Amino acid sequence: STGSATTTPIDSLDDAYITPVQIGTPAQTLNLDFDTGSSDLWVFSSETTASEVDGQTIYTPSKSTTAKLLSGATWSISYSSSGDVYTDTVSVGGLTVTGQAVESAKKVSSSFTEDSTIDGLLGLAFSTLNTVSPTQQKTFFDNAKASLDSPVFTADLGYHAPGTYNFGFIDTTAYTGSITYTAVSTKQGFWEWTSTGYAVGSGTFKSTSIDGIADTGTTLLYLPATVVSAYWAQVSGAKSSSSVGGYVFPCSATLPSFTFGVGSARIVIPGDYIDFGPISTGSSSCFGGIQSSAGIGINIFGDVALKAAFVVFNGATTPTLGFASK
């Protein structure tokens, strides 16, 4: 079997993408953030303290006939949120998984409460990072793998437009040219991989190894200080501000494109994708799309980078990552 769902940006800047998901019988449709950077399926529930809910759709397990409490199991995660665990039927664009662990939130940080559009997260990293204790639970993709035609899923995120998440197949019309596959390392539990270099604007390709993670749940591109300093050196008037917490540039400037190497191929990010609008309403300074990873511990290839390509997350015995131009 296969699954296909549409994903839509939450706002004008592409801060996150929400996908409708059917949890329960009769179904309750929640709008979740598909995150390849984590491994938990958690939702705003009927058990969340009422003060931390501000417009979100809530999951109510008392109203579902296929819901069962996973007695004794508990979760706690930080990127924060914690609570109870139930098992129920989850379906994504027609693809149905019975017995999925659905993590019911009891506590949620104010960063989630302020985002009324996001009803929860659907973790798509490797199951080793699942926070359910004492019995670690499997992700939606790991539970569907046996029932899928092919153990894969693709990501076709749109620039100021909706996009798609397919499961069990590859759409040969969604991209141009061919797909370039690279080796994944599952040691840290992420879709970890090595880029073969970069180029700023119409410049020369600097061949160098950049180890990072492909993360749909992170908005921006976080690369090393040397690479980020080389980029912003080409934008007149750009500068790393302490007060803002990163690079900013005069909104009147035109950004050059950025290229990242996948094996022998090249994936181009247009300049426009790197502009995250003004810092405050009516401001003359704009926020940068390429920021330094120095204070994180890992390079993150977020939405800014991923939405310039047709990305394949091959979950075979030996996982790989595929990138193609679109």
Swiss-Prot record:
Disulphides: C251-C286
Alphabetically, the GO molecular function entries are:
aspartic-type endopeptidase activity
Q: Which residues form the Peptidase A1 domain?
A: 17-324
Q: Which terms are listed as keywords in the entry? A: Aspartyl protease, Disulfide bond, Hydrolase, Protease, Signal, Zymogen
Q: Which residues form the active site?
A: D35, S195
Catalysed conversion reaction: Hydrolysis of proteins with specificity similar to that of pepsin A, prefers hydrophobic residues at P1 and P1', but does not cleave 14-Ala-|-Leu-15 in the B chain of insulin or Z-Glu-Tyr. Clots milk
Q: What class of enzyme is it?
A: hydrolase
Q: Which residues are in coiled coils?
A: none
- At the top level, the lineage of the source is Eukaryota
Q: What is its EC number?
A: 3.4.23.22
BP terms from Gene Ontology: proteolysis
What family does the database annotate?
A: Belongs to the peptidase A1 family.
Q: What is this protein called?
A: Endothiapepsin
What is the species of this protein?
A: Cryphonectria parasitica
Q: Which gene encodes it?
A: EAPA
**Residues included from the entire protein:** 90 to 419 of 419
